[PDB]
Write a protein that holds these residues in place. Structure first.
Motif, PDB file in Angstrom:
ATOM      1  N   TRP A   1       3.379   1.609  -8.680  1.00  0.00           N
ATOM      2  CA  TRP A   1       3.313   0.275  -8.095  1.00  0.00           C
ATOM      3  C   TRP A   1       4.584  -0.043  -7.316  1.00  0.00           C
ATOM      4  O   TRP A   1       4.533  -0.338  -6.123  1.00  0.00           O
ATOM      5  N   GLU A   2       5.722   0.022  -7.999  1.00  0.00           N
ATOM      6  CA  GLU A   2       7.007  -0.259  -7.368  1.00  0.00           C
ATOM      7  C   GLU A   2       7.078   0.362  -5.977  1.00  0.00           C
ATOM      8  O   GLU A   2       7.675  -0.205  -5.062  1.00  0.00           O
TER       9      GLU A   2
ATOM     10  N   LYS B   1      -2.793  -8.588 -12.136  1.00  0.00           N
ATOM     11  CA  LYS B   1      -1.523  -8.760 -11.439  1.00  0.00           C
ATOM     12  C   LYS B   1      -0.411  -7.984 -12.137  1.00  0.00           C
ATOM     13  O   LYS B   1       0.608  -7.656 -11.527  1.00  0.00           O
TER      14      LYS B   1
ATOM     15  N   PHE C   1      -3.349  -1.248  -6.743  1.00  0.00           N
ATOM     16  CA  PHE C   1      -2.210  -1.738  -5.975  1.00  0.00           C
ATOM     17  C   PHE C   1      -1.551  -2.923  -6.675  1.00  0.00           C
ATOM     18  O   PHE C   1      -2.217  -3.799  -7.228  1.00  0.00           O
ATOM     19  N   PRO C   2      -0.210  -2.951  -6.654  1.00  0.00           N
ATOM     20  CA  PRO C   2       0.569  -4.022  -7.281  1.00  0.00           C
ATOM     21  C   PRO C   2       0.432  -5.348  -6.543  1.00  0.00           C
ATOM     22  O   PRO C   2       1.127  -5.599  -5.558  1.00  0.00           O
ATOM     23  N   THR C   3      -0.471  -6.199  -7.025  1.00  0.00           N
ATOM     24  CA  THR C   3      -0.700  -7.500  -6.410  1.00  0.00           C
ATOM     25  C   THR C   3       0.594  -8.078  -5.849  1.00  0.00           C
ATOM     26  O   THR C   3       0.586  -8.779  -4.838  1.00  0.00           O
ATOM     27  N   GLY C   4       1.707  -7.781  -6.514  1.00  0.00           N
ATOM     28  CA  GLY C   4       2.995  -8.280  -6.067  1.00  0.00           C
ATOM     29  C   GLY C   4       3.988  -8.425  -7.203  1.00  0.00           C
ATOM     30  O   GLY C   4       5.181  -8.619  -6.973  1.00  0.00           O
TER      31      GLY C   4
ATOM     32  N   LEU D   1       5.055  -1.729   1.928  1.00  0.00           N
ATOM     33  CA  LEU D   1       4.757  -2.892   2.756  1.00  0.00           C
ATOM     34  C   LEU D   1       6.019  -3.420   3.429  1.00  0.00           C
ATOM     35  O   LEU D   1       6.028  -3.697   4.629  1.00  0.00           O
ATOM     36  N   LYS D   2       7.088  -3.553   2.650  1.00  0.00           N
ATOM     37  CA  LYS D   2       8.358  -4.044   3.170  1.00  0.00           C
ATOM     38  C   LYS D   2       8.748  -3.301   4.444  1.00  0.00           C
ATOM     39  O   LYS D   2       9.537  -3.798   5.247  1.00  0.00           O
TER      40      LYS D   2
ATOM     41  N   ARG E   1       4.175   1.620  -4.007  1.00  0.00           N
ATOM     42  CA  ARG E   1       3.102   1.064  -3.192  1.00  0.00           C
ATOM     43  C   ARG E   1       3.572  -0.187  -2.456  1.00  0.00           C
ATOM     44  O   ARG E   1       3.356  -0.330  -1.252  1.00  0.00           O
ATOM     45  N   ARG E   2       4.213  -1.092  -3.187  1.00  0.00           N
ATOM     46  CA  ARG E   2       4.711  -2.333  -2.604  1.00  0.00           C
ATOM     47  C   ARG E   2       5.899  -2.063  -1.685  1.00  0.00           C
ATOM     48  O   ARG E   2       6.020  -2.667  -0.619  1.00  0.00           O
ATOM     49  N   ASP E   3       6.771  -1.153  -2.105  1.00  0.00           N
ATOM     50  CA  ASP E   3       7.948  -0.803  -1.319  1.00  0.00           C
ATOM     51  C   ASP E   3       7.548  -0.282   0.057  1.00  0.00           C
ATOM     52  O   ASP E   3       8.380  -0.172   0.957  1.00  0.00           O
TER      53      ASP E   3
END
Ligand SMILES: [Zn+2]
Length: 69
Positions: free
Chosen positions: A49-50, A38, A15-18, A56-57, A52-54
């Motif tokens: 990643w781009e 990271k 997962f993309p830490t951020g 959460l938003k 996975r994080r998208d």
């Protein structure tokens, strides 16, 4: 062919830490961090990643604060 031609995606990675960049260490050859890194580990990985994080938003927002040091 089976189990859905297009209805089948195989994207399971860390997962993309951020962050949204590539790991120079990894790209070079070997990285110190590894899984708890990271940075991204492979152009391909980044792509995922781009997203996975998208995900959460979905509930999170941008407007958080100035956090100016
Ligand atoms: Zn790394």
């Amino acid at each position: 062919g089976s189990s859905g031609s297009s209805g089948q995606y195989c994207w399971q990675h860390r997962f993309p830490t951020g962050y949204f960049s590539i790991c120079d260490r990894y790209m070079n050859g070997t990285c110190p961090e590894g899984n708890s890194c990271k940075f991204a580990h492979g152009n391909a990985e980044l792509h995922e990643w781009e997203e996975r994080r998208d995900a959460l938003k979905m509930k999170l927002n941008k407007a958080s604060g100035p956090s100016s040091g």
